[PDB]
Amino acid sequence: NEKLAKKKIVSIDAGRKYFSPEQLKEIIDKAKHYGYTDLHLLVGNDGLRFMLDDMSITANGKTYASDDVKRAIEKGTNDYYNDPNGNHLTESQMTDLINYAKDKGIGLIPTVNSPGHMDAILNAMKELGIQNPNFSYFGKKSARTVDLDNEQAVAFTKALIDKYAAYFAKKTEIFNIGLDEYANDATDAKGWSVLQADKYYPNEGYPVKGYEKFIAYANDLARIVKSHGLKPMAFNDGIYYNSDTSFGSFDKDIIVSMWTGGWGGYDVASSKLLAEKGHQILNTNDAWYYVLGRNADGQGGGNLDQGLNGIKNTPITSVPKTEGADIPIIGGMVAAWADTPSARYSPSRLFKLMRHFANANAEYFAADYESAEQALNEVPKDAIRSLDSNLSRAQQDTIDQAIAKLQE
Amino acid sequence: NEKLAKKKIVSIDAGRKYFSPEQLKEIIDKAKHYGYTDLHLLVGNDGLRFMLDDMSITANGKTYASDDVKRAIEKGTNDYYNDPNGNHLTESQMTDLINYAKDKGIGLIPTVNSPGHMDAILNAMKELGIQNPNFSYFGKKSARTVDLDNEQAVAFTKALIDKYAAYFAKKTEIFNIGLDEYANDATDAKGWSVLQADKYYPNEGYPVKGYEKFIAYANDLARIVKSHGLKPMAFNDGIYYNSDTSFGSFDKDIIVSMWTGGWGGYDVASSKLLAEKGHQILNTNDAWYYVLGRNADGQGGGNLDQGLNGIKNTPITSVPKTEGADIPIIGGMVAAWADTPSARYSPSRLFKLMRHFANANAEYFAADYESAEQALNEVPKDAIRSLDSNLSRAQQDTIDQAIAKLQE
Ligand SMILES: CC(=O)N[C@H]1/C(=N/OC(=O)Nc2ccccc2)O[C@H](CO)[C@@H](O)[C@@H]1O
Ligand SMILES: CC(=O)N[C@H]1/C(=N/OC(=O)Nc2ccccc2)O[C@H](CO)[C@@H](O)[C@@H]1O
């Protein structure tokens, strides 16, 4: 069935906040249990929390030694938030995690975010001797965003992505380069307008070729990822921002994680425009968002009850900003975020979100056969087998009737 | 139940195209059958197809005689499209239609559109001696939109709305003043930007206080409608366009028919902003749109199969441009339109749309008790009664099992 063949993805922000391999395996088990197909794991998102064994970087006519890069990144991340739970996943842990997921039929999609949400990398680059990597807006320095005029900072960042992409090659299918929310701290969430401004309002102090350079940067990352046999993904907001096609084009192989329909003064391209350009669309509707430590109404945007309500009200098939058109999607992604990374991670709350997303879109999620397997095993060792292995969660109680056997 | 208490509305464009009282009663019967609560009947929308017995209008220090107004409007409408099926509903027919609907528990919501989509009224005003009522944009004259600088044209239009509102008083609850798509012909669908332009780009030939005057106009119509005990409704696109609150405010009693999340260069306010301003929201998602004579993919926007797919993919609870927030709604409205008014009206196609909207949102629509009543009557005259009169279409087959009795 076509619905069941879609991707159903849970997203976890292990960039801002540390998650242990054990916690992540537990998430993987629940994902499999509920009919999900993939774990989307941000490891670079403000913080950078995945260290390769060899972190040496060649860029700028030199090689930054592995030990030096590791030190700079570890500290860069800790300056953002020194998490008492841990700093980073190691390469051994990631290889094991990917294999553990794969053995269960769960794929892994990493994110290493740039040119925004890269606090730790910027911090690292500074320690390594790269001057003024940060974008500044009229005196206000972005903590999270690289200046695209800074050739050395850009070359280092590209080489770091390439290094990660070389690792994830053959172990994974998709690599999310991110691209969301350029200089959102320094511009009060007006980054794309700011990058486009100089073209239409010249000689006013706006970044010359700002957006043009962003386009070139995004496409170069896309080529880098694809050179390792990987499909690039990115968040939608900066992609043909304001529906403006006059700055250049985006590479069609960029899968768009469509998370926002925009807001006042933040006029993103519709998913209709993006799909018509040829981009595949992953529905990542922010109606479903959950930010750790926000549980009920009044606790702010992305609170759990808001996310659970978005899940109930806005199904997997309902994409942001469609113009009423029929947008084809590769599937849908529900996202948990750690904006305040010191908040306590609650497995039960995350699984409640995941369960609700699966149950509210039951025809899209493979039925739970684990329960049935478990029951057969619990039969003293001294229907179920014949029911087709292709039901959805919508037909779940069928299976739960066959487990209601128990006696004989 | 809260879901069942929502409004579920079918919209019919009897402004562009003539619909007979008989056709409309048939629509009302189907609406009741499927669990709808209201018929939204545009009678002024490009064409004007409802004539009051007394059409005399006092404005501009004079009274335009009823017979003169009737002649001008009838011709104005025919110049738009002289429909061989008929020109207008009469007052007797409308009073009967409203009563017929009311007796069945179906409300009627009329639309008389302005200051856009008012071809016939503009045509009429010209015949009646009002000079240059039409908005022009750099030489290009709008056929559909009144110039808000034209005091006499504005005063006549306001008085016509007041006349209709006086008629609909006590017979109805809501009056839709429309307000969609200002000068969409003459500006290539850029009307709101055009009205706002002079404020930010002065001395360039843009309408001085264009949007400011639109705001005053909308609010005056709102006061007029409310003076007859009616709640005003309007389409969302012109309401705080571009999320700009610096031109003035909209009256909070304006219920917003939220039909569009906007598109490239057409940056409407989010339903989040509108709801936070205090506006009640009627979900009128254009994903569900059906334009008569467009049946399959490739036949253009609003084709039937597109509407049926929008209905399947986007439920009644999914509002345009929410910013991911929980938007409260008074209910939802599915709309059939006659953009090409010479297209053949197909009852079966319209009922298919209506049926699908009801079945795709089954928990919102009152169950069909008419079938059960019919069966009891067909019992030779020489369970059903006890099942609660409060089920939704989701529990329909319960009732259809009780009708599967038939024999004894
Ligand atoms: C692509 C994305 O979601 N980026 C940021 C992001 N941006 O969201 C907004 O700018 N606004 C918003 C916040 C909560 C829910 C919906 C939209 O949302 C997440 C939750 O706050 C952040 O953790 C992400 O880093
Ligand atoms: C409020 C509204 O819908 N206005 C016009 C309207 N505006 O729609 C658009 O501008 N674009 C559009 C067309 C079809 C489906 C969705 C959006 O849609 C209807 C169907 O074309 C027209 O009949 C209406 O007059």
Side-chain angles (χ1 to χ4, degrees):
Chain A
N1 169 254
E2 188 145 11
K3 296 185 183 167
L4 287 169
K6 297 296 182 188
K7 284 191 171 299
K8 285 79 55 166
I9 310 175
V10 60
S11 185
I12 304 296
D13 178 13
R16 294 188 176 101
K17 182 174 182 53
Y18 180 83
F19 280 78
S20 76
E22 294 82 359
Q23 287 169 323
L24 292 169
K25 285 178 176 179
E26 189 189 29
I27 296 169
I28 288 156
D29 295 346
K30 291 276 160 178
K32 181 55 192 280
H33 188 70
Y34 292 130
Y36 286 81
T37 58
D38 300 275
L39 162 65
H40 181 267
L41 185 64
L42 297 97
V43 294
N45 189 232
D46 297 10
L48 179 52
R49 303 194 183 274
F50 175 41
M51 207 77 84
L52 301 178
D53 288 335
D54 167 27
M55 288 291 285
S56 60
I57 296 291
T58 296
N60 312 316
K62 66 166 293 197
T63 295
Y64 306 84
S66 183
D67 284 344
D68 293 328
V69 179
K70 288 181 189 187
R71 186 182 313 110
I73 286 171
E74 175 136 23
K75 170 71 170 182
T77 289
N78 287 336
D79 280 354
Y80 169 80
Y81 170 53
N82 195 334
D83 194 332
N85 293 331
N87 178 275
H88 63 268
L89 293 168
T90 66
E91 181 171 337
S92 287
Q93 290 169 340
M94 182 68 74
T95 301
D96 176 74
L97 187 67
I98 291 169
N99 292 321
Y100 180 91
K102 202 174 287 175
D103 287 342
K104 291 178 76 91
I106 298 294
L108 191 145
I109 304 160
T111 307
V112 179
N113 214 331
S114 76
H117 293 290
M118 57 173 300
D119 308 47
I121 300 161
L122 294 164
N123 293 337
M125 283 194 293
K126 284 183 264 108
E127 174 175 317
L128 293 167
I130 295 159
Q131 320 272 257
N132 306 126
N134 307 242
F135 179 80
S136 286
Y137 181 65
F138 287 92
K140 176 143 207 342
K141 192 191 71 172
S142 176
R144 311 173 179 154
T145 299
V146 72
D147 185 347
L148 301 168
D149 288 337
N150 192 317
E151 291 192 13
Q152 327 84 60
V154 168
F156 185 94
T157 301
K158 281 179 189 180
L160 188 59
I161 302 297
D162 185 70
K163 202 84 184 194
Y164 283 113
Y167 166 79
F168 286 114
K170 290 190 136 246
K171 302 191 184 66
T172 62
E173 146 197 32
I174 297 154
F175 189 107
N176 189 345
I177 55 175
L179 311 185
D180 61 319
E181 304 179 331
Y182 191 92
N184 73 327
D185 52 343
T187 66
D188 297 304
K190 299 286 287 194
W192 309 115
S193 289
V194 166
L195 290 183
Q196 294 185 347
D198 184 69
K199 166 156 184 179
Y200 299 109
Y201 309 96
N203 317 124
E204 298 223 55
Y206 298 122
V208 156
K209 304 299 176 194
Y211 192 68
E212 294 94 325
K213 283 193 167 110
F214 169 74
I215 291 184
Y217 179 84
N219 289 326
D220 207 27
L221 286 192
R223 180 185 299 168
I224 286 158
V225 166
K226 282 190 288 179
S227 78
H228 298 288
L230 296 169
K231 289 197 254 268
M233 187 159 74
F235 296 119
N236 69 281
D237 53 301
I239 306 178
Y240 301 109
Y241 179 82
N242 196 36
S243 298
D244 198 324
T245 64
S246 81
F247 286 87
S249 303
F250 289 80
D251 186 304
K252 279 205 285 180
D253 289 325
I254 301 163
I255 299 165
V256 171
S257 178
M258 190 83 191
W259 72 276
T260 187
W263 56 85
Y266 202 86
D267 312 298
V268 307
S270 73
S271 51
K272 180 187 200 288
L273 184 153
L274 297 177
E276 282 171 5
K277 280 288 170 301
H279 298 275
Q280 293 186 129
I281 306 294
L282 174 67
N283 192 358
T284 313
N285 203 308
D286 65 2
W288 314 321
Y289 273 16
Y290 162 47
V291 177
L292 271 52
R294 305 187 196 155
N295 296 333
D297 191 37
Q299 267 144 51
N303 71 79
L304 184 59
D305 290 332
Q306 198 192 243
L308 296 173
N309 272 287
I311 286 176
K312 181 161 65 51
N313 288 335
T314 300
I316 198 168
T317 53
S318 186
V319 182
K321 200 171 201 190
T322 62
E323 311 185 31
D326 194 355
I327 312 305
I329 57 163
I330 64 167
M333 181 162 73
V334 61
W337 299 101
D339 299 38
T340 303
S342 55
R344 192 181 78 90
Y345 166 55
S346 174
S348 68
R349 291 188 190 271
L350 173 63
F351 309 148
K352 183 178 187 174
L353 188 79
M354 291 168 61
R355 173 166 64 255
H356 277 235
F357 188 56
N359 290 336
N361 302 281
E363 270 131 274
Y364 286 79
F365 289 70
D368 160 40
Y369 292 98
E370 291 175 346
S371 212
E373 281 286 65
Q374 224 307 283
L376 292 173
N377 290 154
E378 282 265 325
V379 167
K381 302 185 178 295
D382 268 288
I384 296 164
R385 229 73 157 260
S386 62
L387 37 81
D388 68 311
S389 66
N390 300 117
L391 300 169
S392 74
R393 286 188 68 85
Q395 292 86 46
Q396 185 63 46
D397 59 20
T398 297
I399 294 163
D400 295 12
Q401 279 154 207
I403 300 155
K405 199 164 144 198
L406 176 65
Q407 291 302 322
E408 162 153 30
Chain B
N1 169 254
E2 188 145 11
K3 296 185 183 167
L4 287 169
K6 297 296 182 188
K7 284 191 171 299
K8 285 79 55 166
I9 310 175
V10 60
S11 185
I12 304 296
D13 178 13
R16 294 188 176 101
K17 182 174 182 53
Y18 180 83
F19 280 78
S20 76
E22 294 82 359
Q23 287 169 323
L24 292 169
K25 285 178 176 179
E26 189 189 29
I27 296 169
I28 288 156
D29 295 346
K30 291 276 160 178
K32 181 55 192 280
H33 188 70
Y34 292 130
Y36 286 81
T37 58
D38 300 275
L39 162 65
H40 181 267
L41 185 64
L42 297 97
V43 294
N45 189 232
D46 297 10
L48 179 52
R49 303 194 183 274
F50 175 41
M51 207 77 84
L52 301 178
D53 288 335
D54 167 27
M55 288 291 285
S56 60
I57 296 291
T58 296
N60 312 316
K62 66 166 293 197
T63 295
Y64 306 84
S66 183
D67 284 344
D68 293 328
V69 179
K70 288 181 189 187
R71 186 182 313 110
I73 286 171
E74 175 136 23
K75 170 71 170 182
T77 289
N78 287 336
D79 280 354
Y80 169 80
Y81 170 53
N82 195 334
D83 194 332
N85 293 331
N87 178 275
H88 63 268
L89 293 168
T90 66
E91 181 171 337
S92 287
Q93 290 169 340
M94 182 68 74
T95 301
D96 176 74
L97 187 67
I98 291 169
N99 292 321
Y100 180 91
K102 202 174 287 175
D103 287 342
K104 291 178 76 91
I106 298 294
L108 191 145
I109 304 160
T111 307
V112 179
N113 214 331
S114 76
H117 293 290
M118 57 173 300
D119 308 47
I121 300 161
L122 294 164
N123 293 337
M125 283 194 293
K126 284 183 264 108
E127 174 175 317
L128 293 167
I130 295 159
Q131 320 272 257
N132 306 126
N134 307 242
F135 179 80
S136 286
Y137 181 65
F138 287 92
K140 176 143 207 342
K141 192 191 71 172
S142 176
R144 311 173 179 154
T145 299
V146 72
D147 185 347
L148 301 168
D149 288 337
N150 192 317
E151 291 192 13
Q152 327 84 60
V154 168
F156 185 94
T157 301
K158 281 179 189 180
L160 188 59
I161 302 297
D162 185 70
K163 202 84 184 194
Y164 283 113
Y167 166 79
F168 286 114
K170 290 190 136 246
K171 302 191 184 66
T172 62
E173 146 197 32
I174 297 154
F175 189 107
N176 189 345
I177 55 175
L179 311 185
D180 61 319
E181 304 179 331
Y182 191 92
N184 73 327
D185 52 343
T187 66
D188 297 304
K190 299 286 287 194
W192 309 115
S193 289
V194 166
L195 290 183
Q196 294 185 347
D198 184 69
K199 166 156 184 179
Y200 299 109
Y201 309 96
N203 317 124
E204 298 223 55
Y206 298 122
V208 156
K209 304 299 176 194
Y211 192 68
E212 294 94 325
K213 283 193 167 110
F214 169 74
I215 291 184
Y217 179 84
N219 289 326
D220 207 27
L221 286 192
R223 180 185 299 168
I224 286 158
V225 166
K226 282 190 288 179
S227 78
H228 298 288
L230 296 169
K231 289 197 254 268
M233 187 159 74
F235 296 119
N236 69 281
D237 53 301
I239 306 178
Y240 301 109
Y241 179 82
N242 196 36
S243 298
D244 198 324
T245 64
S246 81
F247 286 87
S249 303
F250 289 80
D251 186 304
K252 279 205 285 180
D253 289 325
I254 301 163
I255 299 165
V256 171
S257 178
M258 190 83 191
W259 72 276
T260 187
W263 56 85
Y266 202 86
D267 312 298
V268 307
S270 73
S271 51
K272 180 187 200 288
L273 184 153
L274 297 177
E276 282 171 5
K277 280 288 170 301
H279 298 275
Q280 293 186 129
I281 306 294
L282 174 67
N283 192 358
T284 313
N285 203 308
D286 65 2
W288 314 321
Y289 273 16
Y290 162 47
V291 177
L292 271 52
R294 305 187 196 155
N295 296 333
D297 191 37
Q299 267 144 51
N303 71 79
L304 184 59
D305 290 332
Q306 198 192 243
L308 296 173
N309 272 287
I311 286 176
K312 181 161 65 51
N313 288 335
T314 300
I316 198 168
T317 53
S318 186
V319 182
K321 200 171 201 190
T322 62
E323 311 185 31
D326 194 355
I327 312 305
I329 57 163
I330 64 167
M333 181 162 73
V334 61
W337 299 101
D339 299 38
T340 303
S342 55
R344 192 181 78 90
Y345 166 55
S346 174
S348 68
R349 291 188 190 271
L350 173 63
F351 309 148
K352 183 178 187 174
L353 188 79
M354 291 168 61
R355 173 166 64 255
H356 277 235
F357 188 56
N359 290 336
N361 302 281
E363 270 131 274
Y364 286 79
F365 289 70
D368 160 40
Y369 292 98
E370 291 175 346
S371 212
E373 281 286 65
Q374 224 307 283
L376 292 173
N377 290 154
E378 282 265 325
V379 167
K381 302 185 178 295
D382 268 288
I384 296 164
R385 229 73 157 260
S386 62
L387 37 81
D388 68 311
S389 66
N390 300 117
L391 300 169
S392 74
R393 286 188 68 85
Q395 292 86 46
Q396 185 63 46
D397 59 20
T398 297
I399 294 163
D400 295 12
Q401 279 154 207
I403 300 155
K405 199 164 144 198
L406 176 65
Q407 291 302 322
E408 162 153 30

